[PDB]
């Protein structure tokens, strides 16, 4: 009976983060997951923009990037379907033709501004060849506080997991989960709702069963790491892959099968306190991203969190094509963008109709 007085925060059960932003984070996460709404992911790096601009022959300049963001962000009415926008660092500081910074434009329209805060993929070194970690925790707090100060209220950080030969190394499962959990708590300390994105990539010849097993294993470890690092669950979101066949598998799945495999996997791992899942569209067509989300919102399986979208190409492909990089295509590009946003809004509600889409 040797005893000692300790701080509660030195005891294992008292590891939960204490952040003065807790109430605001919870309110933001609720706004981001409003019924009928999802996120526009507009956080392509300058390198991604060259890919986006390749088809329309628009040169990759800071001004052209601004105009591509403006196509979507200066589009009247998108706030009916979009609750939040993930910006790139460059765009956070750019101005709309309204004279406002993009974050100020968003806030005026009731849309939450967010920021992609990771610093990109690098070789994992441990594990197997081709596996990747994500850089960016050094100087994270200073960066995140600066983004909060210009009006951002959520952030996004992407880790990826590459299925090869039916599996992924335990090294990548552990290390990427630890990275995401550390990112999430540092974000919350600085007043940003973290979107935790553990993307099991569509690339490869694996089938949907393999995607399900790998996704379940990867995401369970992300959840375990989030408990260990003390995340405020109620102020966090998940941005996962849907569970689908690999892109080179030659296997096709119906919308109902994708929904069943995806939702059963999330239901096995994801605490109901987490307010929402914002699916990435990664490699699905525009229409499939809508059909699949809609099937999830008609699933009879347990799904206490909001299931919505955080879409980049699935919101923008038709829009970019109709825009053509020209001021004369702005109207047609916005009509295509607004059509996709409305389809995804209906999909969130489970009321999307494929025949109306075509």
């Amino acid at each position: 009976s040797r005893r000692v007085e300790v701080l509660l925060t030195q005891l294992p059960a008292y590891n939960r983060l204490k952040t003065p932003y807790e109430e605001e984070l919870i309110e933001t996460a609720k706004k981001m997951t409003a019924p009928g709404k999802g996120l526009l992911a507009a956080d392509e790096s300058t390198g991604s923009c060259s890919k986006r601009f390749a088809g329309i022959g628009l040169s990759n300049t800071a001004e052209h990037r601004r105009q591509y963001r403006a196509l979507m962000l200066e589009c009247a009415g998108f706030e009916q379907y979009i609750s939040g926008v993930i910006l790139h660092d460059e765009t956070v500081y750019q101005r709309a033709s309204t004279g406002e910074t993009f974050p100020q434009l968003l806030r005026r329209r009731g849309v939450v501004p967010g920021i992609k805060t990771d610093c990109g993929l690098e070789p994992l070194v441990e594990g197997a060849d081709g596996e990747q970690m994500t850089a960016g925790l050094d100087g994270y707090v200073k960066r995140a506080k600066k983004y909060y100060a210009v009006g951002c209220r959520f952030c996004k950080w992407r880790n990826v997991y590459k299925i090869q030969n039916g599996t992924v190394s335990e090294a990548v499962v552990r290390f990427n989960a630890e990275t995401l959990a550390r990112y999430a708590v540092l974000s919350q300390l600085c007043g940003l709702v973290p979107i935790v994105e553990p993307e099991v990539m569509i690339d490869g010849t694996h089938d949907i069963e393999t995607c399900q097993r790998v996704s379940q294993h990867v995401w369970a470890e992300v959840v375990s790491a989030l408990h260990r690092h003390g995340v405020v669950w109620e102020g966090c979101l998940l941005k996962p892959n849907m569970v689908v066949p690999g892109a080179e598998s030659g296997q096709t799945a119906t919308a109902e099968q994708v929904a069943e495999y995806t939702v059963k996997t999330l239901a096995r791992v994801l605490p109901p306190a987490l307010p929402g899942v914002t699916f990435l569209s990664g490699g699905l067509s525009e229409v499939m991203a809508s059909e699949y989300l809609n099937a999830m919102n008609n699933s009879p399986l347990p799904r206490p969190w909001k299931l919505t979208f955080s879409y980049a190409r699935a919101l923008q492909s038709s829009a970019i094509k109709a825009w053509g990089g020209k001021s004369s295509g702005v109207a047609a590009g916005r009509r295509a963008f607004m059509h996709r946003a409305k389809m995804n809004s209906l999909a969130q509600l489970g009321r999307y109709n494929r025949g109306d889409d075509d």
Partner: nanobody
Amino acid sequence: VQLQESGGGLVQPGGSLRLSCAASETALTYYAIGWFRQAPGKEREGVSCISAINSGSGARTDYADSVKGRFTISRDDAKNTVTLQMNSLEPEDTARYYCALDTTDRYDSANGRYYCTISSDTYAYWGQGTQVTVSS
């Protein structure tokens, strides 16, 4: 989506018409809205526009020089309608009239207000239009 124009008809010089623009599946509240017309042999041209509503001071409006003082645009966000009152009609007002939504968020932050333009470049969702004929 399309908007739906109505209220067209035949009137004599000096007469009046009230055009109505209805949206059945879109919340007009988020948009500046324009009325346009296309006379025989001419391109479609802006007649009138009305901005999103500004708190306290109400919507701003604009008009083509040819119709200033004769036409009044107004909007009802509760009934989801925009109206064009046309007075003192002349033969030269004969045209098919169309309403359309501006796809641009027309906010001017330096002046703190929503505005609108008569230029058709950023508008979309043109309805089938409504015919207005002015003659004896």
